[PDB]
Amino acid sequence: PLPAIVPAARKATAAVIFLHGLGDTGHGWAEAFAGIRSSHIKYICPHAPVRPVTLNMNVAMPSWFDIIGLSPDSQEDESGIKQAAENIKALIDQEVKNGIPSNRIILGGFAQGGALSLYTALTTQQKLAGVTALSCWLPLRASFPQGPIGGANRDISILQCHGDCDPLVPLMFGSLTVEKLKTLVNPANVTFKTYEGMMHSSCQQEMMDVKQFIDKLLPPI
Ligand SMILES: CCCCCCCCCCCCCCCC(=O)O
């Protein structure tokens, strides 16, 4: 259905597109971003389609792409990630058609959605304002060139968050992802923040770190 949105009180001069995690909807994150909303920023939380998930023996659940395993050597749904990223590209392009330029748009997500937002930002030619990647990883690591990506977003700013007690997406997945991100874009704009005791969820301190990151890269007027 239609994405869960936190409308800008005013006119929207910026936008945040946040992608939920596996099995979720956009409603919960939309409500979370309502608590850190800035009156000139529209917040968009799309809903992943219900689809079979291989690791659950194809029980159908909301998922941006198929998951085969949790190990860093598990085969990844290459065509699904790529096609899902193309859907997010279209979601960014329509916000531009409606008024908000892409360089006024932050793309982000949590876990599977955070993986998708990272892949999308690093492979699209639309210039984005930044990335907020929570408790996630870089999908299709080895498909990336061996140096900087170059192109639109080679200087994109990435705030990446992770809980140090995550049992599902281990903390070392995020830190290694941040190591890869530092070789893919300008490392002076890549921030890795860890939250002690936090598992595979979010905390208010992280939500306020996220707002501080959004408010600086997307200030008014
Ligand atoms: C960058 C190196 C580490 C990551 C290498 C690939 C690991 C992929 C496995 C992670 C799948 C996690 C399942 C999603 C959970 C959720 O969406 O909440």
From Swiss-Prot:
Domain of life (superkingdom): Eukaryota
Entry keyword Protease: no
Activity regulation as described: Inhibited by palmostatin-B, leading to impair depalmitoylating of Ras.
Localization (cell): Cytoplasm; Cell membrane; Nucleus membrane; Endoplasmic reticulum
Pfam families listed in its UniProt record: Abhydrolase_2
Assigned protein family: Belongs to the AB hydrolase superfamily. AB hydrolase 2 family.
Keyword set includes Ribonucleoprotein: no
Major location category of this protein: cytoplasm
Name the record gives this protein: Acyl-protein thioesterase 1
Keyword tags: Acetylation, Cell membrane, Cytoplasm, Endoplasmic reticulum, Fatty acid metabolism, Hydrolase, Lipid metabolism, Membrane, Nucleus
Single GO MF descriptor: carboxylic ester hydrolase activity
Cellular component annotations (GO), alphabetically ordered: cytoplasm; cytosol; endoplasmic reticulum; extracellular exosome; mitochondrion; nuclear membrane; nucleoplasm; plasma membrane
InterPro entries: AB_hydrolase_fold (IPR029058), LYPA1-2/EST-like (IPR050565), PLipase/COase/thioEstase (IPR003140)
Active site residues of this protein: A111, D166, H200
Signal peptide boundaries: none
Protein task: Acts as an acyl-protein thioesterase. Hydrolyzes fatty acids from S-acylated cysteine residues in proteins such as trimeric G alpha proteins or HRAS. Acts as a palmitoyl thioesterase that catalyzes depalmitoylation of proteins, such as ADRB2, KCNMA1 and SQSTM1. Acts as a negative regulator of autophagy by mediating palmitoylation of SQSTM1, decreasing affinity between SQSTM1 and ATG8 proteins and recruitment of ubiquitinated cargo proteins to autophagosomes. Acts as a lysophospholipase and hydrolyzes lysophosphatidylcholine (lyso-PC).
SUPFAM superfamilies assigned to the protein according to its UniProt record, in alphabetical order: alpha/beta-Hydrolases (SSF53474)
Catalytically driven reaction(s): S-hexadecanoyl-L-cysteinyl-[protein] + H2O = L-cysteinyl-[protein] + hexadecanoate + H(+); 1-hexadecanoyl-sn-glycero-3-phosphocholine + H2O = sn-glycerol 3-phosphocholine + hexadecanoate + H(+); a 1-(9Z-octadecenoyl)-2-acyl-sn-glycero-3-phosphocholine + H2O = a 2-acyl-sn-glycero-3-phosphocholine + (9Z)-octadecenoate + H(+)
Noted pH dependence of activity: Optimum pH is 7.4 for the thioesterase activity.
GO biological process entries: fatty acid metabolic process; fatty acid transport; negative regulation of aggrephagy; negative regulation of Golgi to plasma membrane protein transport; protein depalmitoylation
Enzyme class label: hydrolase
UniProt modified residues of type N6-acetyllysine: K216
Tissue: Platelets.
Description of how the protein assembles with itself and partners: Homodimer.
Entry's EC annotation: 3.1.2.-, 3.1.2.22
